[PDB]
Write an enzyme that holds these catalytic residues in place. Structure first.
Site, mmCIF file in Angstrom:
data_model
loop_
_atom_site.group_PDB
_atom_site.id
_atom_site.type_symbol
_atom_site.label_atom_id
_atom_site.label_comp_id
_atom_site.label_asym_id
_atom_site.label_seq_id
_atom_site.Cartn_x
_atom_site.Cartn_y
_atom_site.Cartn_z
ATOM 1 N N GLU A 87 -24.697 25.065 -15.717
ATOM 2 C CA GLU A 87 -24.731 24.440 -14.397
ATOM 3 C C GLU A 87 -24.099 23.053 -14.179
ATOM 4 O O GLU A 87 -23.341 22.846 -13.227
ATOM 5 C CB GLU A 87 -26.201 24.405 -13.923
ATOM 6 C CG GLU A 87 -26.454 23.695 -12.590
ATOM 7 C CD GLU A 87 -26.120 24.548 -11.384
ATOM 8 O OE1 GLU A 87 -25.871 25.760 -11.561
ATOM 9 O OE2 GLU A 87 -26.115 24.006 -10.258
ATOM 10 N N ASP A 95 -21.896 19.439 -14.771
ATOM 11 C CA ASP A 95 -20.612 18.909 -15.219
ATOM 12 C C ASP A 95 -20.772 17.505 -15.790
ATOM 13 O O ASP A 95 -21.886 17.052 -16.035
ATOM 14 C CB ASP A 95 -19.590 18.891 -14.068
ATOM 15 C CG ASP A 95 -20.079 18.137 -12.842
ATOM 16 O OD1 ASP A 95 -21.078 17.401 -12.941
ATOM 17 O OD2 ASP A 95 -19.445 18.275 -11.772
ATOM 18 N N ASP A 99 -20.514 23.439 -18.272
ATOM 19 C CA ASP A 99 -19.887 23.868 -17.019
ATOM 20 C C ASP A 99 -18.511 23.190 -17.047
ATOM 21 O O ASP A 99 -17.955 22.974 -18.116
ATOM 22 C CB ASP A 99 -20.700 23.408 -15.791
ATOM 23 C CG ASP A 99 -19.809 22.859 -14.649
ATOM 24 O OD1 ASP A 99 -19.179 23.646 -13.898
ATOM 25 O OD2 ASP A 99 -19.700 21.622 -14.517
ATOM 26 N N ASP A 112 -15.396 17.903 -11.407
ATOM 27 C CA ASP A 112 -15.285 18.694 -10.188
ATOM 28 C C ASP A 112 -15.068 17.803 -8.984
ATOM 29 O O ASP A 112 -15.537 16.668 -8.942
ATOM 30 C CB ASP A 112 -16.538 19.539 -9.967
ATOM 31 C CG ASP A 112 -16.763 20.529 -11.076
ATOM 32 O OD1 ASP A 112 -17.184 20.093 -12.167
ATOM 33 O OD2 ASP A 112 -16.504 21.736 -10.863
ATOM 34 N N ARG A 147 -7.453 24.849 -16.420
ATOM 35 C CA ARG A 147 -7.668 24.011 -15.269
ATOM 36 C C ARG A 147 -7.494 22.512 -15.436
ATOM 37 O O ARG A 147 -8.481 21.794 -15.682
ATOM 38 C CB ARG A 147 -9.062 24.221 -14.712
ATOM 39 C CG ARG A 147 -9.460 25.659 -14.549
ATOM 40 C CD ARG A 147 -10.901 25.668 -14.128
ATOM 41 N NE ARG A 147 -11.472 27.000 -14.134
ATOM 42 C CZ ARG A 147 -12.707 27.269 -13.742
ATOM 43 N NH1 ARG A 147 -13.498 26.293 -13.305
ATOM 44 N NH2 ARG A 147 -13.150 28.513 -13.800
#
EC number: 4.2.2.2
Length: 361
Positions: A142, A144, A184, A188, A241
């Protein structure tokens, strides 16, 4: 308290989105009573409670967000590990060991958060103690290392280092015949956030790294936002990413990507991921991917539901690349700020490597 790090008073550079439509100055205008020096979680949150007040929070040593007490469950972790950064804050590391662990730095603009500067600090990715099982998708972690969401804007990440640290993915265990995934994404940037500049930073050893524009349905909110400028950063040993972006308008120039398509733990997949309605302008970047033939150069930029990607003078293994045949539309939008994209060389990339990350300000 007193001010030790002298560069703490600095604001983001003219270069970058974090300097567009307003300036990012963090807690520069902080009063002496809003200049702290935290050494543990208590002090940290104690200072952060100055809220929207201009503040300069100096990190000394390692801050264990868990406060020594490991998280009992998801609730517990949710409750204690998600540290929020209030508007007009400058979290700057002192010396080389400014480090955070067992937590997430959250820049959530729900209460109007904006104008933040996380600088010269190491953030070891958090380990989720209760990952959910998405039947068919297995275990999912979950938290970051840092999340920028809910409209947050004018944030400047500089000389920051996000890594898996003493706990890398090859140490994962397996619960119920599945791999207990406890990490995670690293960084983000979602739900309407905007005007962000990440520079001189190091993201090293991680799977799902930077996701900009969390959902490709959220469009309306994300449409025409998420402007992120990344320069002089170093993405080392990260699986996928660099920016994997939906809607955003990524400007990644003079950055240093270095990995290996056959790495034992973090297997290079790609760097730029052009998602739904996304756009990336790559320039003077250095792509050093072990086991990647020039005849497969397009592996560095993968498609999803997007197409707008343009690269200029970047290199793959010390030689000019040509991503033109990969089939992408040109980045026609303008870059409002003025900037100098230096011709990428072994010296340059080598230099960028040396000065990227915390403990090197």
């Amino acid at each position: 308290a007193e001010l030790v790090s002298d560069k703490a008073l600095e604001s983001a550079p003219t270069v970058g989105w974090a300097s567009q439509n307003g300036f990012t100055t963090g807690g520069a205008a902080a009063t002496s009573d809003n200049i702290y020096i935290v050494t543990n979680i208590s002090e940290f949150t104690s200072a952060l409670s100055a809220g929207a007040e201009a503040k300069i929070i100096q990190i000394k040593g390692t801050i264990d967000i868990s406060g020594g007490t490991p998280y009992t469950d998801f609730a517990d972790q949710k409750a204690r590990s998600q540290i929020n950064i209030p508007a007009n804050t400058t979290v700057i590391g002192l010396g080389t060991d400014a480090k955070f662990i067992n937590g997430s730095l959250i820049i959530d603009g729900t209460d109007g958060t904006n104008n933040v500067i996380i600088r010269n600090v190491y953030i070891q990715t958090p380990i989720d103690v209760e990952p959910h099982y998405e039947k068919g998708d297995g275990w999912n972690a979950e938290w970051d290392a840092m999340n920028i969401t809910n409209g947050a804007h004018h944030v400047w990440i500089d000389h920051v280092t996000i890594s898996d640290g003493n706990f890398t993915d090859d140490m994962y265990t397996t619960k119920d015949g599945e791999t207990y995934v406890q990490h995670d994404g690293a960084l983000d940037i979602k739900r309407g956030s905007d005007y962000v500049t990440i520079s001189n930073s190091l993201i090293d050893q991680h799977d799902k790294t930077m996701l900009i524009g969390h959902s490709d349905s959220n469009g309306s909110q994300d449409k025409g936002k998420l402007h992120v400028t990344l320069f002089n950063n170093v993405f080392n040993r990260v699986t996928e990413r660099a920016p994997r972006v939906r809607y955003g308008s990524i400007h990644s120039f003079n950055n240093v990507f270095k990995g290996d398509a056959k790495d034992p733990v973090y297997r290079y997949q790609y760097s730029f991921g052009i998602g739904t309605s996304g756009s990336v302008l790559s320039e003077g970047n250095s792509f050093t991917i072990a086991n990647l033939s020039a005849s497969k150069a397009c592996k560095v930029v993968k498609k999803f539901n997007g197409s707008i990607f343009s690269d200029n003078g970047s290199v793959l293994n010390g030689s000019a690349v040509d991503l033109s045949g990969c089939g992408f539309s040109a980045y026609t939008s303008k870059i409002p700020y003025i900037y100098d994209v230096q011709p990428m060389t072994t010296e340059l990339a080598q230099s960028i490597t040396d000065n990227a990350g915390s403990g090197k300000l």
